């Protein structure tokens, strides 16, 4: 612990504090955009859950997991990973589709074989019906969505400004819509709508979680800055005293 070592470390941590505070404010600004997109998708989802409240539809299996590709979220990815893992362990026959590189990674390492398809890069901006519709088309054509008796999707629900809940939502198959070709296309449409709503909610939750994570990081950086400021003062005084002792010893002979 030389004076230069402490100085370098202190300045580095001060830089980190600035970076984390800036990210916290930027996420706070982005959060309102995410929230209004969330509301817009929420009402469109309510419009169909109103119908299902009357139709009362009810259910191998297919599971879609939705997250972004990038970290610093504070367990946004791992909680949903745990939810999907503990769901899958009861029925490992189910195939799964991973949206988001993080959830892809955290499922691949523990349940490698049943990952049918991975969708990447779509968690950056607020989700669009374009992305949801194209993903639904790929899921139907390539992943053969229509062949499964059960389909459900997993996401992070923005419960509160400080917390989120891993939640599952069922996409009832055309066979389940037909009784409890209009039912087929209604399946496709509700598939796209539910996936869009899940992406929007997960995006809002992720932005809020990243905001809170950077807030915690800024608190911790400030505490470290206090500690190393104290250490710097101690080392400064020690250096002055030791060099002065050397000078005095040289003088006193």
């Amino acid at each position: 612990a030389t004076l230069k070592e402490v100085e370098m470390r202190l300045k580095s941590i001060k830089n980190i504090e600035k970076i984390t505070k800036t990210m916290k404010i930027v996420a706070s600004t982005r959060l309102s955009k995410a929230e209004k997109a969330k509301i817009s998708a929420k009402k469109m989802d309510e419009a169909e859950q109103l119908f299902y409240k009357n139709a009362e539809t009810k259910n191998k299996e297919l599971i879609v997991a939705i997250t972004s590709d990038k970290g610093l979220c504070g367990s946004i990815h791992s909680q949903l990973a745990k939810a999907v893992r503990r769901h899958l362990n009861d029925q490992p026959n189910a195939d799964i589709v991973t949206i988001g590189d993080k959830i892809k990674m955290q499922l691949l390492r523990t349940h490698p074989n049943n990952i049918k398809l991975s969708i990447n890069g779509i968690g950056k901006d607020a989700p669009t019906f374009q992305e949801s519709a194209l993903i639904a088309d790929k899921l139907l054509s390539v992943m053969k969505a229509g062949t499964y008796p059960k389909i459900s999707i997993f996401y992070n629900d923005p419960v509160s400004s400080l917390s989120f809940e891993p939640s599952e939502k069922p996409i009832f198959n055309a066979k389940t819509i037909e009784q409890s070709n209009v039912p087929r296309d209604l399946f496709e449409y509700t598939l796209a709508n539910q996936m869009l709503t899940a992406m929007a909610q997960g995006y809002a939750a992720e932005i809020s979680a990243r905001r809170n994570a950077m807030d915690n990081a800024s608190k911790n950086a400030g505490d470290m800055i206090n500690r190393y400021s104290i250490l710097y003062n101690r080392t400064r005084q020690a250096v002055i005293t030791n060099e002065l002792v050397d000078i005095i010893t040289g003088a006193s002979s």
Partner: protein, 126 residues
């Protein structure tokens, strides 16, 4: 005369110093921060000065007036240096009365200040 115009330059540069960290996150800027950055960048660019090139007070006053009052916002940053030397050369040929009055009296009277504004806008239009 310089105190009158430079009073707010300090405030704007302080705000810019506080907001500077956001430039690397331009993808989502609060409009306040965006405008603050746009103004502070041009003020900082305006304060650059070549060696052995001291400016008279009546040559500093128009430049800082234009910078503070935001007339530079419509000018590309890379050519702020072209603006200043041009603007002065305009004044000393089209509004030399204002420069002479600022030099002689040392104050920006309200009518003189309005004339300075009019001259600044008359130049920035071209």
């Amino acid at each position: 005369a310089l105190k009158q115009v430079a009073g707010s330059l300090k405030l704007f540069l302080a705000q810019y110093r506080e907001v500077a960290a956001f430039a690397q996150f331009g993808s989502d800027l609060d409009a306040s921060t965006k405008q603050t950055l746009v103004r502070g960048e041009r003020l900082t660019q305006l304060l650059k000065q070549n060696q052995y090139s001291p400016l008279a007070t009546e040559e500093q006053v128009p430049l800082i007036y234009a910078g503070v009052n935001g007339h530079l916002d419509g000018i590309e940053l890379s050519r702020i240096g072209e603006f200043e030397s041009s603007f002065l050369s305009y004044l000393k040929s089209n509004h030399n009365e204002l420069l002479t009055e600022i030099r002689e009296k040392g104050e920006l009277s309200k009518e003189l200040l309005a004339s300075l504004k009019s001259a600044t806008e008359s130049f920035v239009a071209t």
